[PDB]
Design an enzyme around this catalytic site. Structure first.
Site, PDB file in Angstrom:
ATOM      1  N   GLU A  31     -73.629  10.378  75.689  1.00  0.00           N
ATOM      2  CA  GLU A  31     -74.750  11.279  75.333  1.00  0.00           C
ATOM      3  C   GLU A  31     -74.318  12.725  75.077  1.00  0.00           C
ATOM      4  O   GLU A  31     -74.962  13.671  75.534  1.00  0.00           O
ATOM      5  CB  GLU A  31     -75.958  11.206  76.312  1.00  0.00           C
ATOM      6  N   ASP A  32     -73.212  12.885  74.338  1.00  0.00           N
ATOM      7  CA  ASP A  32     -72.665  14.176  73.930  1.00  0.00           C
ATOM      8  C   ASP A  32     -71.851  14.953  74.964  1.00  0.00           C
ATOM      9  O   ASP A  32     -71.808  16.177  74.933  1.00  0.00           O
ATOM     10  CB  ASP A  32     -73.685  15.021  73.131  1.00  0.00           C
ATOM     11  N   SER A  33     -71.176  14.226  75.860  1.00  0.00           N
ATOM     12  CA  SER A  33     -70.236  14.805  76.814  1.00  0.00           C
ATOM     13  C   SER A  33     -68.863  14.543  76.153  1.00  0.00           C
ATOM     14  O   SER A  33     -68.782  13.808  75.148  1.00  0.00           O
ATOM     15  CB  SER A  33     -70.275  14.086  78.168  1.00  0.00           C
TER      16      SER A  33
END
Ligand SMILES: [Zn+2]
Ligand SMILES: [Zn+2]
Ligand SMILES: [Zn+2]
EC number: 2.7.7.6
Lengths: 134, 266, 65, 46, 114
Positions: free
Chosen positions: A3-5
């Protein structure tokens, strides 16, 4: 890294990857009005005043200014100023409660109005940590 | 001898290429890991800046100082300051370097690792001498100075391991490859038309017989023979990165064996 | 802002290589790719280290104080 | 030797009281910068 | 700011021991050893050797959370074989393998010319 890490390599970080300098300039001028009621740049004490921040003023020199080189943190008073309300009254500038660093440069100059005025630059190296955006 | 077997293909002052046969993948990897992170080294861990009139920041400089490779040959005969009974540091646990540099010329004055100077008493140990590998004998450009520019600082170099800070890494990249033919089917090749034509074969293929299509998949086969190349940063010679790598791993297994003994009392 | 000591990714020292690199381009009149290889920068993590380094210290030094 | 303030222009080592205004004695600039502490700052080389 | 000291990866704290043997509940002759200030360098290495033991029924390890430098090792053995002894022999076997490697690399390096 979902999730965009992203997973960053700490080994490469230690070597200098995305390391940055951070600077913040604090500013103050000696008064605005009153030929008799003029503020003062000084390391202030008890003198009936007590309106202090404390936030230790202990890092300041006699001129109410931190020497470039000293380490600063939390609410350390970076600029000491007093207001004559008659004894003195505090007008000192603490460092941003959140911040900490090393006093980088301190410019002691004058304004067009013949005002004693100062700029205090504080340096902080920021190493890539956890929730840091890239 | 008995267990693991070594064949050195090529060797230099800063690089070993060898085949590690008759081994467990757990062992080869744990050895690869321990060479990267746990062999003790000596690196600058404290800088006291007396004077800096350079264009570079205090910490910017102090950061690069830690990255300068220092002689780590006789490192086990230097203590970790945390175990040293001294107050802070001494000659039993640390090396002290000095850096004084001034822009004498109009022309840019360069500051190198050659310019660091051991002040400490080494007590006849091969330790702390900045590692110099460039042909001009300068090794590592720490800084650059103008005319009025000056830099005066003091370095306390200490024992440590990469696991605490990458500066303490005696090695750079460790090449590692087993089964260059994928006879083991440990990877599944991504393709468009022909994996064989699409994937470049390893230099290591020369050292092994090709799969031979008209043979069923060897299910029982296990990964034993590991094509490695260990690169040294300089602090410790290449032979020593592997020998100390073995010895460190060997040591940390012995500490478990000894822990079992200690908890076997009351 | 000066040749980083050591390649971020791998660790190979790169601080001792900058000046040698410029000479190889200037004096020897070589291309960047052969120059990087002449310095023994085999992996692309090491090549990018020097190839993409912008040396702002030269600009910074140009300032009068 | 014991600097209080340095001129920002001519790099002049000077020092004067709040009863001596601002300016640099023979340069004539109103800039000025505080000189570094002699406290000695320690850094981890990390 | 909230970051632990990097020494906390390899250095034991106050009131903290290396190994912590714990009898398993779910199965007989099984034990659970918590290795403090250790990682995949040791966890994998020991587990793989423990599997070469014919009297070992089960051998696995895990690092429950990457922040913390610790791993849990599960060992189940044949009735009559105590797991601590399987881990004892596991370790020695490793040490012997390493010493032979050490010697062989050393014998090879001495033939090499450069
Ligand atoms: Zn000591
Ligand atoms: Zn690299
Ligand atoms: Zn002046």
């Amino acid at each position: 890294n979902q999730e965009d890490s992203m997973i960053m390599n700490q080994s490469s970080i230690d070597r200098g990857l995305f390391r940055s300098l951070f600077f913040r300039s604090y500013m103050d001028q000696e008064k605005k009005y009153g030929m008799s009621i003029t503020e003062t740049f000084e390391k202030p004490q008890r003198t009936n005043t007590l309106r202090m921040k404390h936030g230790t003023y202990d890092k300041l020199d006699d001129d109410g200014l931190i020497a470039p080189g000293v380490r600063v943190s939390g609410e350390d008073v970076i600029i000491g100023k007093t207001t004559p309300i008659s004894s003195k009254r505090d007008a000192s500038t603490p460092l941003r409660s959140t911040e900490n660093g090393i006093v980088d440069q301190v410019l002691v100059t004058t304004n067009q109005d013949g005002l004693k005025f100062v700029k205090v630059r504080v340096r902080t190296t920021k190493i890539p940590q956890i929730g840091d955006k890239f | 001898e008995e267990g693991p077997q070594v064949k050195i293909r090529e060797a230099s002052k800063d690089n070993v290429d060898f085949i590690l046969s008759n081994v467990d993948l757990a062992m080869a990897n744990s050895l690869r890991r321990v060479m990267i992170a746990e062999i003790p080294t000596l690196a600058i861990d404290s800088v006291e800046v007396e004077t800096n009139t350079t264009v570079l920041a205090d910490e910017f400089i102090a950061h690069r100082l830690g990255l300068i490779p220092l002689q780590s040959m006789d490192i086990e005969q230097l203590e970790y300051s945390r175990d040293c009974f001294c107050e802070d540091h001494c000659d039993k646990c640390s090396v002290v370097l000095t850096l004084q540099a001034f822009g004498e010329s109009e022309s840019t004055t360069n500051v190198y690792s050659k310019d660091l100077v051991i002040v400490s008493n080494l007590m006849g140990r091969n330790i702390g001498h900045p590692i110099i590998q460039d042909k001009e004998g300068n090794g590592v450009l720490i800084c650059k100075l103008r005319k009025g520019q000056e830099l005066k600082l003091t370095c306390v170099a200490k024992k440590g391991i990469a696991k605490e800070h990458a500066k303490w890494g005696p090695a750079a990249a460790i090449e590692f490859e087993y089964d260059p033919w994928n006879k083991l089917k440990h990877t599944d090749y991504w393709y468009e038309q022909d994996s064989a034509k699409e994937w470049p074969q390893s230099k290591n293929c020369e050292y092994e017989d090709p799969p031979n299509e008209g043979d069923p998949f060897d299910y029982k086969a296990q990964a034993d023979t590991f094509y490695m190349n260990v690169e040294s940063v300089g602090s410790i010679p290449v032979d020593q990165v592997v020998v100390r790598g073995i010895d460190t791993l060997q040591k940390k297994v012995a500490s478990i064996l000894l822990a079992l003994t200690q908890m076997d009392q009351d | 802002m000066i040749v980083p000591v050591r390649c971020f990714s791998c660790g190979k020292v790169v601080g001792d290589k900058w000046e040698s690199y410029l000479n190889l381009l200037q004096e020897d009149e070589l291309d960047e790719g052969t120059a990087l290889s002449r310095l023994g920068l085999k992996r692309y993590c090491c090549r990018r280290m020097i190839l993409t380094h912008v040396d702002l210290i030269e600009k910074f030094l140009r300032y009068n104080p | 030797a014991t600097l209080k303030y340095i001129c920002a222009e001519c790099s002049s080592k000077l020092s004067l009281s709040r009863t001596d205004a601002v300016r640099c004695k023979d340069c004539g600039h109103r800039i000025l910068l505080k000189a570094r502490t002699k406290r000695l700052v320690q850094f981890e080389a990390r | 700011m909230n970051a632990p000291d990097r020494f906390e990866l390899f250095l034991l704290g106050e009131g903290e021991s290396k190994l912590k043997i714990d009898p398993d509940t779910k199965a007989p002759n099984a034990v659970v050893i918590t290795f403090e200030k250790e990682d995949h360098t040791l966890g994998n290495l020991i587990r793989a050797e423990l599997l070469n033991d014919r009297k070992v029924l089960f051998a696995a390890y895990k690092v429950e959370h990457p922040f913390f430098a610790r791993f849990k090792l599960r060992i189940q053995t044949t009735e009559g074989y105590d797991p601590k002894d399987a881990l004892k022999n596991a370790c020695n076997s490793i040490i012997n393998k390493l010493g032979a490697l050490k010697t062989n690399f050393e014998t090879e390096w001495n033939l090499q010319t450069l």
